[PDB]
Design a protein around this ligand. Structure first.
Ligand SMILES: CCc1onc(C)c1-c1ccccc1
Ligand SMILES: CCc1onc(C)c1-c1ccccc1
Lengths: 115, 108
């Protein structure tokens, strides 16, 4: 569907996060071969990234805004679970997620489809 | 505010009573749990008891500020614990409810 909330997530949330200076590691799936992480998919069972979320928003994949929000959440949570506390990537994730939450605070309150 | 009232009476109430919520209702007690490295790794402790008290005492100026505290609580859990620890699954479950409920908060 196309809803007011999903439009907000696309036009405000994804817009802000996609172009952020710390976004680059999150713009495509974690490539375990490229990064040399043979345990990544053993630990992270549901990979998620902003390229996938962006494509899903562009293709009207989501039925509800909550579904998109859960994908954002999974992406960040995967990062915190896999990486060491002191890794820079954790700081980058935290910075992006703070923006996510700040913007989500102003999202339309009721979901409804555009005719 | 309208949003802070919602975070207190709708969001926090639902999370608080959940069967996986008990570890999160008060600060992590590193002494009781025997974890000398907890406060060396987690520099901003947060829990729902602290958030609830802040809501009750009008500490927050905006809903976003309160939401950030919820996020810090969950993130601390993911950062400190092993991926396979049950507490991680408990946090994930509560976090999903948090986002579900936040989606329906008044927009202002
Ligand atoms: C295992 C490292 C890692 O964990 N989460 C992300 C994102 C990354 C990442 C880091 C650098 C480039 C691309 C992804
Ligand atoms: C260090 C373990 C831990 O990490 N986050 C929480 C919450 C807990 C916790 C686990 C059991 C009881 C109380 C808190």
């Amino acid at each position: 569907r196309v809803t007011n909330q999903l439009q907000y997530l696309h036009k405000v949330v994804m817009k802000a996060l996609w172009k952020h200076q710390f976004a680059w590691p999150f713009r495509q799936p974690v490539d375990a071969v490229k990064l040399g992480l043979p345990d990544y998919h053993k630990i992270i069972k549901q990979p998620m990234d902003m390229g996938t979320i962006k494509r899903r928003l562009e293709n009207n994949y989501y039925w509800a805004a909550s579904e998109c929000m859960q994908d954002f959440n999974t992406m960040f949570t995967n990062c915190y679970i896999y990486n060491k506390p002191t890794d820079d990537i954790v700081l980058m994730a935290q910075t992006l997620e703070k923006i996510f939450l700040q913007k989500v605070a102003s999202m339309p309150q009721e979901e409804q489809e555009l005719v």
